[PDB]
Amino acid sequence: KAAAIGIDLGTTYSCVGVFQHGKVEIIANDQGNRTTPSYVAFTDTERLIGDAAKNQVALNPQNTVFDAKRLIGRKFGDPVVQSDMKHWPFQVINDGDKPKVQVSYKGETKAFYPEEISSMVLTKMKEIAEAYLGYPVTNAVITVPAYFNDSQRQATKDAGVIAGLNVLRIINEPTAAAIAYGLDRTERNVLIFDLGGGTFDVSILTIDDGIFEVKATAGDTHLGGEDFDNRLVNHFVEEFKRKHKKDISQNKRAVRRLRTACERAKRTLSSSTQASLEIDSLFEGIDFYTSITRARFEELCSDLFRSTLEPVEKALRDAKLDKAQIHDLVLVGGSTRIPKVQKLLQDFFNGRDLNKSINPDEAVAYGAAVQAAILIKST
């Protein structure tokens, strides 16, 4: 019968997988991308989700929503909501102690609950899976951070039901990554090092007889790939001032366009030692054609890369385990593809091999897809 799917509903990107013909297929979207931005944009004529939404952000900042995972299942009074709101270009309103995102859509003011925004992202992932499978998909496993509370898990499950999905189970992101690597089929102590687009999560699990126990969680909810992009943005703003004698830092569109180029250059630096950066008419008709070296990017982010080890040390203390007691070091998130981040973690664990054979950007969806296939058999 119809296969069930695994969905990694990420803060910045989402990913969908399916276990078919004895293997996991991570499904590419219509643009050919195996991950989709967790973005929704509203225009005078349409609602855009994923790549098309992220692509037009510089020309529609107030009506392009992202980071709904930071609001989902929270009350307006939550300290996290109170702190996070100042950093977003879109409006957050308060409706009886519930946050809602307020936008302009088809020439009208509309407001959506966080679970309605995440339901739009989940509808996109469901449609990406149906385009590959060729039949309607109704069952899914959706992942969440280990630290999510009952309200945040319930709101995520509600987002799935709004999307027309029957949610077989809400499972922890680190548990899904461990399932992907077969770590439950080898007491096994696993460290999941999840450096995402906007958050950094370290989890220590103990797996015994198929049972997962969360021994410790540590990290920084405000450290991720976006922060490395911003170190490049600042460096380039300074370069533009030196070359052209113009300060672009107050031009919101120019900064946004520069940030988009920086993210692309950063990805290239994970596989090449140099990356070109080329923007046409960045400011006042001036074309900004330049380049950056991997060594310079490493210098610009040196403090941030080093800071990823403190949460690892903290999690080991909380779990009451030494480095030698950890059996597996699992990489999660595209930011773990950065060679310097891998070198720092390997050196900390005295040269040990890292589990990185599954694309780190896809490992959570991969594990969710394996678990979805196991659970649908039971129904």
Catalytic residues: 8, 69, 173, 194
DSSP percent split of the chain into helix, strand, coil, nearest 5: 40, 30, 30
- Return the number of the residue (6 or 10) whose C-beta is nearest Mg ion: 10
> What would the two tokens of residue 369 be?
């897809």
Residue 292 Cα distances to 62, 119, 200, 205, 245, angstroms: 31, 39, 25, 39, 20
Least CB distance to Mg ion at residue 97 (A): 28
Is 264 labelled a binding residue? yes
**Binder of residue 240, out of Mg ion, ligand 5P7, none (CB less than 5 to 8 A by kind):** none
* Nearest distance from C-beta of residue 204 to Mg ion, angstroms: 17
Would the annotation count 25 as a binding residue? no
**263 labelled ligand-binding:** yes
- Per-residue CA distances from 183 to 30, 192, 212, 301 (Å): 33, 11, 10, 32
Two structure tokens written together for 128:
């990406």
Judged by CB, which is closer to ligand 5P7: 13, or 113?
A: 13
Which of these segments, 74-82, 156-164, 194-202, 203-211, binds Mg ion (CB under 5 A)? 194-202
Q: Pick what 174 binds: ligand 5P7, Mg ion, none; C-beta below 5 to 8 Å, kind-dependent.
A: none
Smallest distance from Mg ion to CB 342, Å: 17
**Strands, E assignment, 113-197:** 139-144, 166-172, 188-195
Based on the shown chain and the rule CB under 5 A, indicate whether residue 10 belongs to the binding site for Mg ion: yes
> Was 268 annotated as part of a binding site?
yes
State yes or no: residue 360 binds Mg ion (CB under 5 A): no
For ligand 5P7, the binding residues (CB under 6 A) are 12-13, 196-197, 225-226, 263, 266-267, 270, 333-335, 337-338
Please indicate if the annotation marks 169 as binding a ligand.
no
Cβ proximity to Mg ion: between 114 and 196 the closer is 196
DSSP secondary structure, 317-355, as one string: HHHT--GGG--EEEEESGGGG-HHHHHHHHHHTTT---B
Residues 6+ positions from 100 with CB-CB distance below 8 Å: 92, 93, 94, 111, 112, 113, 114
- 10 annotated as a binding-site residue: yes
197 binds Mg ion (CB under 5 A): no
CB of 9: closest distance to ligand 5P7 in angstroms? 12
DSSP state letter for 369: H
Task: Single out the residue of 119, 107, 66, 55 nearest to residue 88, CA to CA.
Answer: 66
| Minimum distance, C-beta of residue 256 to ligand 5P7, in the bound complex (Å) | 15
Residue 96 identity (one-letter amino acid): G
Q: Helix or strand or coil: residue 177?
A: helix
d(CA 10, CA 372): 18
Instruction: Please check if 14 is assigned to a binding site.
Output: no
Nearer CB in complex with ligand 5P7: 270/371: 270
When the beta carbons of 12 and 152 are compared against ligand 5P7, the nearer one is 12
Which of 196, 224, 225, 360: binder of Mg ion (CB under 5 A)?
196
Binding-site residue set: 10-13, 69, 197-199, 263-270, 334-337
Residues lying near Mg ion in the complex (CB under 5 A): 10, 196
Binding-site residue set for ATP: 10-13, 69, 197-199, 263-270, 334-337
